[PDB]
Amino acid sequence: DVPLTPSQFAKAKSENFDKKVILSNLNKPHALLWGPDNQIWLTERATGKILRVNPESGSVKTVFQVPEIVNDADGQNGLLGFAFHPDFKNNPYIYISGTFKNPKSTDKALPNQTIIRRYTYNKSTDTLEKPVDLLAGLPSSKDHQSGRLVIGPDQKIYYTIGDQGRNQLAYLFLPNQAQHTPTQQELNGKDYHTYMGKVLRLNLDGSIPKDNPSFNGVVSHIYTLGHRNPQGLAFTPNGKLLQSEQGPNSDDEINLIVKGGNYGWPNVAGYKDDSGYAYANYSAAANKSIKDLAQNGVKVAAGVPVTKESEWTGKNFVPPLKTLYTVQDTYNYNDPTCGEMTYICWPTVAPSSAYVYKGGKKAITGWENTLLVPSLKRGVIFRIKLDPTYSTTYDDAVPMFKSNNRYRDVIASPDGNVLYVLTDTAGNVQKDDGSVTNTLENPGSLIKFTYK
C-alpha cells in the first residue's frame, strides 16, 4: 500500500468510542490476552510479572513473577511469549518464552538465551508452579526478539523468533541468519543458531513435530523462514495463520503463514519488486569503518556488496498480503522534519501485534472478518478487512484511535463492543503534526475503548 500522510493519521480520532484508562505506569507491558476465566491477563516484559485484571471491577493481582528474566534498559529482551492451553479447564497450562542467562556462553556480545517454558496453574493457591523447559538454547539479543507464542487448532505451539537485529545498527556486521537452516549435525547437537527470523512449530512437550516441513532434507522445529521482526501471529477460526512483521525503512507486512514458506527477508522486503529496497550485506563489507547510509539499500556507501530483490536465488518465496508501506526508489529517507529520530518519518507503521476480531452479541457494525494491528510509531490501531475465508485482504489498513502513544497489543471483549489496548512505558511516536515526541499521553497503560 501507499503511505498515509501525517494529516490522514491525525484525523483517525474514533469519536464513536469512549476511552477509559484501567491501569497506568506498568513496567513495559507487552502481551495481552482474554483469559479462560473471563479476566484480562497481561505481562510486564521487564519484570517477568504476569498480571490478571478483573474487567468488571478493575482490581489487579500479580499472579506470578517468572524468576531470573534478563532485561536490558536498551533492549527488547525479557518476558516475551505468553499463551494459555486451548482446553484450560481440562489442561491448566501457561506457555511463555523469556530471556535468561546462558551459562555456557563464550561470546560476551551474546550472553543470553531464549527459553520456551511451560507452567501449571494451581487454582487452590491461585499461582503458577512446576516449570517445564520445552526448548532452550534459542538465540537471544537486544533487538528483533519478536516472541509471539500461540497454540494452533492442531494443538502445536507456533512461535515467532526474530532475526536478532543482524545487518542493522549495533549488529550491523553480523551475518543475517533468516535464510539459514540447521544441518542434520547441528540439529542432532541441539545447536539452534539458525533459529533466527523463523516461525517455529513445536509439539507441546517441545519435541519436533513428525509432520514439520523439511529444509535441505532436515526436519527441525522450523515451520517458515525468511522473517525480520514478526511481532504479530494469530489463527483465524477456519485454521489460517495471519501474521504482522516489521520491515526496515519500508514494507512492514501482513503475511499468510503457509507450511514451509520462505518469506524472503533479508533478500526481499515486501513484494519482489525492486522498489525502494535492495539487500546490502554488511557482514560481507570490506571493513567495519564502512557506514550504513540508511537508504534501505537504494543507495549504499562504497565497500558493501548489494543485490536487487529480483536477483535473489531463493526458493518457495511467499509475498505479503499487504505492505505498510511500499515506496518507489525516488522516496526521501532523509526527512529532516523528524529531527534526529529520522526512522519515525520512514514509510512504515511498526506493527506490534495482530488480532483476529471474533465478533459477538454486541459486535461493531462492519467489523466482521477483520484483523486489528496496533502501530508503535504512528499511535494508531489499524483495522484490516479480509474476505470471510481470510484468503485475501479487502481494501486498505484503516487507522483508528490516533494518540501520542505507542500501541503494543489489542484484544476485544467476548461481546465485541469493547477493545482493550496496551501502551509502551517509553519511546518515540509521531504526533498529529508529523513531528516526533517522546512525551507519551498514557505511558505503560491498559486502556478500554467502549463502542458508543
Provide the annotated binding site for Ca(2+). Answer: 247-248, 253, 263, 269, 271, 273, 309
Residue in 65, 127, 183, 281 binding Cl ion, rule: CB under 5 A: 183
Place of cell 483469559: 35
Which residue, among 136, 105, 133, has the nearest Cα to 119 in the 3D structure? 133
DSSP per-residue codes, 188-249: HTT--TT-SSEEEEE-TTSPPPTT---BTTB--SEEEE--SEEEEEEE-TTS-EEEEEE-SS
Q: In whole angstroms, how close is the CB of 73 to Ca ion at the nearest point?
A: 16
Q: Is 181 in the site for Cl ion (CB under 5 A)?
A: no
Distance of alpha carbon 219 from alpha carbon 208, whole angstroms: 8
Please pick, among 144, 180, 193, 221, the residue that the annotation labels catalytic: 144
> Among 134-142, 145-153, 180-188, 396-404, which window interacts with Cl ion (CB under 5 A)?
180-188
Residue in 34, 88, 173, 317 binding a copy of itself, rule: CB under 8 A: 317
Q: In whole angstroms, how close is the CB of 322 to a copy of itself at the nearest point?
A: 8
Backbone angles phi, psi at 223, to 5 degrees: -105, -50
Sites for a copy of itself among residues 368-397 (CB under 8 A)? 387, 389, 391-396
Dihedral sign (CA 355, 358, 359, 365): positive
Distance of alpha carbon 396 from alpha carbon 284, whole angstroms: 38
Spatial CB neighbours of 389, under 8 Å, sequence gap ≥ 6: 238
Dihedral sign (CA 164, 167, 170, 173): positive
**215 or 265, CB closer to Cl ion?**
215
Distance of alpha carbon 208 from alpha carbon 194, whole angstroms: 15
Distance of alpha carbon 265 from alpha carbon 252, whole angstroms: 11
List 108's β-bridge partners, or say none. none
Q: In whole angstroms, how close is the CB of 191 to Cl ion at the nearest point?
A: 8
Q: Is 316 in the site for a copy of itself (CB under 8 A)?
A: yes
Distance of alpha carbon 150 from alpha carbon 241, whole angstroms: 10
**40 or 225, CB closer to a copy of itself?**
225
| Residues within the interface to Ca ion (CB under 5 A) | 180, 263-264, 269-271, 273, 277, 350, 376-377
- Residue 185 binding result from Ca ion, Cl ion, a copy of itself, none, given CB thresholds of 5 to 8 Å by partner type: Cl ion
Give first-to-last CA distance, the chain, whole Å. Answer: 30
**65 or 183, CB closer to Cl ion?**
183
Q: In whole angstroms, how close is the CB of 342 to a copy of itself at the nearest point?
A: 23
- Residue 286 binding result from a copy of itself, Ca ion, Cl ion, none, given CB thresholds of 5 to 8 Å by partner type: none
Spatial CB neighbours of 302, under 8 Å, sequence gap ≥ 6: 290
Contact between residue 407 and residue 386 where contact means Cβ atoms under 8 Å apart: no
- Residue 377 binding result from Cl ion, a copy of itself, Ca ion, none, given CB thresholds of 5 to 8 Å by partner type: Ca ion
Binding-site members are: 76, 143, 168, 228, 247-248, 253, 263, 269, 271, 273, 309, 343, 348, 377
3-state SS assignment for residue 339: coil
**20 or 190, CB closer to Cl ion?**
190
Binding-site members for D-glucose are: 76, 143, 168, 228
- Residue 27 binding result from Cl ion, Ca ion, a copy of itself, none, given CB thresholds of 5 to 8 Å by partner type: none
> Among 13-21, 322-330, 405-413, 433-441, which window interacts with a copy of itself (CB under 8 A)?
322-330
Spatial CB neighbours of 292, under 8 Å, sequence gap ≥ 6: 168, 172, 280, 282, 301
Distance of alpha carbon 172 from alpha carbon 285, whole angstroms: 10
**115 or 327, CB closer to a copy of itself?**
327
Q: Is 318 in the site for a copy of itself (CB under 8 A)?
A: yes
List 113's β-bridge partners, or say none. 100
**Stretch 186-225: interaction string toward Cl ion, x if CB under 5 A:** x---------------------------------------
Q: In whole angstroms, how close is the CB of 158 to a copy of itself at the nearest point?
A: 17
Sites for a copy of itself among residues 116-135 (CB under 8 A)? none
Q: Is 185 in the site for Cl ion (CB under 5 A)?
A: yes
Task: Let me know if 207 is exposed, middle or buried by CB neighbors in 10 A (0-12, 13-18, 19+).
Answer: exposed
Does the annotation mark 144 as catalytic? Answer: yes
Query: What are the cell numbers at 255?
Result: 503475511
Distance of alpha carbon 380 from alpha carbon 357, whole angstroms: 17
Residue in 163, 251, 252, 309 binding a copy of itself, rule: CB under 8 A: 309
**Stretch 266-285: interaction string toward a copy of itself, x if CB under 8 A:** -----xxxxx----------
Binding-site members for pyrroloquinoline quinone are: 343, 348, 377
**187 or 298, CB closer to Cl ion?**
187
* Interacting residue ranges for Cl ion, rule: CB under 5 A: 183, 185-186
* Interacting residue ranges for a copy of itself, rule: CB under 8 A: 1-2, 256, 258-261, 271-275, 308-310, 314-319, 322, 326, 328-330, 387, 389, 391-396
- Write out the catalytic residue numbers: 144
